[PDB]
Amino acid sequence: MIDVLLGADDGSLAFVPSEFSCSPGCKIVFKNNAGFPHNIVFDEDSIPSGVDASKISMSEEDLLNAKGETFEVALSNKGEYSFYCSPHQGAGMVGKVTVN
Ligand SMILES: [Cu+]
């Protein structure tokens, strides 16, 4: 599995890592680190065809509010999955996972 920090240790509004690669069955655990609240959203138009975004994404309205809170994702279909934090998207808090 891949552990991803929500917020850099220094408080920067970033996923760490932000771009990473894995294979079918890939599991990702996003953990609130700094600069929260944060969330993790995948838009349907920015993930592979035939993937249900609602099954991998937080709702834009929901947030992880405290250090250490987690949101887990498991991926199957190959392709590129772009994601972002909704409150911090405009600050560049975005990422992409590639399943090859
Ligand atoms: Cu955020």
From Swiss-Prot:
Q: Where is the Plastocyanin-like domain?
A: 2-100
Decide whether keyword Thylakoid is in the record: yes
Disulfide partners: none
What is the required cofactor set for this protein? Answer: Cu(2+)
Q: Where in the cell is it found?
A: Plastid, Chloroplast thylakoid membrane
Q: Where does Cu cation bind?
A: H38, C85, H88, M93
Q: Which key words tag this protein in UniProt?
A: Chloroplast, Copper, Electron transport, Membrane, Metal-binding, Plastid, Thylakoid, Transit peptide, Transport
Provide one Gene Ontology cellular component.
chloroplast thylakoid membrane
Q: Mostly located where?
A: plastid
Q: Relate the protein's function as given in its record.
A: Participates in electron transfer between P700 and the cytochrome b6-f complex in photosystem I.
- Give the protein family: Belongs to the plastocyanin family.
Q: What is this protein called?
A: Plastocyanin A, chloroplastic
Q: Which organism is it from?
A: Populus nigra
Q: What is the lineage of its organism?
A: Eukaryota, Viridiplantae, Streptophyta, Embryophyta, Tracheophyta
Q: Which gene encodes it?
A: PETE
Which region of the full protein is contained in this chain? 70 to 168 of 168
